[PDB]
Symmetry: D2
Subunit: 237 residues, 4 copies
Amino acid sequence: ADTIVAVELDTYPNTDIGDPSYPHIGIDIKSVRSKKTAKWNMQNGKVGTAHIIYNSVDKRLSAVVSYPNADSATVSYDVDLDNVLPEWVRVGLSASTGLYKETNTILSWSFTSKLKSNSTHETNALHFMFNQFSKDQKDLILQGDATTGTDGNLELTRVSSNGSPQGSSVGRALFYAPVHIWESSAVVASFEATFTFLIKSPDSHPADGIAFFISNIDSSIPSGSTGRLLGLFPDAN
Amino acid sequence: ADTIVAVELDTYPNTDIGDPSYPHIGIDIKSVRSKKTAKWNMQNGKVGTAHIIYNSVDKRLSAVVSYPNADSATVSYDVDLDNVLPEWVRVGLSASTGLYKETNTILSWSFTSKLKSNSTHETNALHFMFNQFSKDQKDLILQGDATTGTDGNLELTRVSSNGSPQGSSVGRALFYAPVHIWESSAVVASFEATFTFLIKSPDSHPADGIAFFISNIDSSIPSGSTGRLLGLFPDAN
Amino acid sequence: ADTIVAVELDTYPNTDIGDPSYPHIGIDIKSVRSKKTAKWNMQNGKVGTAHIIYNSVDKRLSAVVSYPNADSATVSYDVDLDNVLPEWVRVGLSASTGLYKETNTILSWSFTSKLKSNSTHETNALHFMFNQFSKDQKDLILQGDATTGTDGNLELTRVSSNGSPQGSSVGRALFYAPVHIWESSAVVASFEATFTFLIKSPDSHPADGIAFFISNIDSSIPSGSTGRLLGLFPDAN
Amino acid sequence: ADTIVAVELDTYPNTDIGDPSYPHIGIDIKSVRSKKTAKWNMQNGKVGTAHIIYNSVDKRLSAVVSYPNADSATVSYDVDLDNVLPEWVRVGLSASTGLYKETNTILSWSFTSKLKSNSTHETNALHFMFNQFSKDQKDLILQGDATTGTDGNLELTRVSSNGSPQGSSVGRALFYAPVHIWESSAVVASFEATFTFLIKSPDSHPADGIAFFISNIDSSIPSGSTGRLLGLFPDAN
């Protein structure tokens, strides 16, 4: 059903479905079994930053994850997204917890998309930036357990009053307007996404992760996609 | 019903409903009878450019209209939009023809909106730019006779195959995502809009005009708003 | 000699040279005696933010100063800068201490300038943003005691090893490239500046202030402009 | 002496110094003998557009050249610029004519550079855009025969009154401020450059080309670099 391309920040090693034995970042092209991963030194309770970049000339989707005063993790994959996704997509953030849990908090999110035509001085662009939310964030579609406005933050999975992360929770937030990622006359198409997140768990093995994704416009949370399937995939294939 | 703030480029003088005796640009706060106007030297068949700017510190909505190698027309009005509009709005372009007519073509449109909070490094922003359209422009809501894709342009009123403008036509295009123009913690809110247009009429008295507007999110074309009411107002009050 | 337009954040009341009896923000057009002031509730040791905006249609220079979780101070002045400044200027930050002192630290600085011509799709723009400095910041001209690189910050007045502010100190930082603020064919010219600052003083009466300024390109610190003259004016006239 | 990285649009085939037998675009890393080329279908008298992009995660410098209603030419090269260039550079445009000639006119030029640190919300950016020039363009360093202001255009090689291109001419324009392309704490560094150009020659074999380049800050035109050496290299090695 849904066409998903995602960059995941996966905190729990489900080695049975192909994860490496550590926290890792990965690029998922239509399956939870990442096409490419890298070890990520996840820091419990610290704000991190993820940068995702792509352009139609190189056809390389790359991601860099960093924490203050630390070395970065980075992963890249050669993929032409014109052959994977529809030309109109929606972009969003998704997260889950399963038996083990964590808060999946989003403190800011920006995205830029550009289509540069072969006509002179002809650029089509979309850009949004959220450094603060609203309880009534009318330009986000919130799905599952995601809520906005808690300390001006976006909470992708259920967090109870006392600040505790809840298990078996899944939530997603997608920007309202469709995003145009191809047009026939375009010489270069590019996008850039950045988000900062706070993953805090009282456990020694937090789970499950955060993912930035791009899907077909009508995408909704697949049934049973809590825990390891990150709110993105119906199964582990 | 709808809350409309608009900057109009009015090509026909309906002096009976308060227009001056010439083409003019004006600022309409909830009524077709402009709060402020200026003479506009309309050029038939030339591409013009309109720039509209506003910010919450000055509370002045100003507009500048220019044509290549010509002097500009400019109009300004002191108005606090937090006291006129809802905090979530949609923005768009509207046009009509009546007994006299003209093509109301839009060749590009950009908009930027910014909410800067009192928190440090906290800006929320939306920015779109259309230098080219699509027949299937999924991030625009097209109403009435507006169509996209004709020479990559947006045609706000009906134009027949041979390029001729049709009379009694009204059309509007609004960007899909709601726009947030106030929040409680904001120290400055601003927006900026620019569009280029081509008004071509085979008549000596073209009618009726183009307007950039900001309305409540569910705004739709009022019944009977062709001709002088620009697709914006239900009546001439 | 130098042509100075500045927005000052003045921490010490030199009522003898016209200050009000409190910390205040003011707009100086070629003299230290502000054309317009507003009371500013200065917070010792907190990071504040200043936003300065101007455009050639309204001809209003306005400034908003805020601290987290506090109400803002704002001041505005009707002034046409085409009649005060040359068309090529440099922009910068300046600060001083006198007998009383304070740290004048700059943690980030961004500026944008735009000249929009009457020709279609013709915008000339300059934009810089510094969220971090360098010991060797080659695109800043540092004058007097200003230094860069101390905790990635810009220190406009002398601070000794142990973190203490020094008295009788004056420093300025200007961006390297000239800025073009008028051209004959421009229909709208605008600029926007933002900076965050930390004023920390161990005294109950800190002095003297920070100012954002725009000057002629070859401007340098006037002789004797420590203390109340903010590194900007040769005298108190 | 100078460290040059350039993307050239080479109109004349000097097959003796390694050019292919056709107009071509190429990536030069410190030598006129391109590391990589692609056939370019040069159109005499038409305005073209060049887009150059690079980022420190992929380490791929790519360029796309297009003309209206035509197919694009594109060339890419894997190169880590931190190992080739200094961390402070200047960027510019260069062109030459030799025995055969052409006008090398620049109608617009924009550049963006970004350094994103591992600190949260810490981006340093420079952005300029020239859609129009000035006879007194004080933020460009013009070298050799380059002049500004002729029809608001930048003329990189000598053009005489009647509009004719002159032979044996070389000129360069560099933006005034140094550009910072690396810093120790940066997780991603990127830049983007775009320019539109008009190459018009009354000859059947125009020469020599236009190049976008990045050099050390004090770079100046090497002696004898007219014709095939594009104003960039001292020799053909």
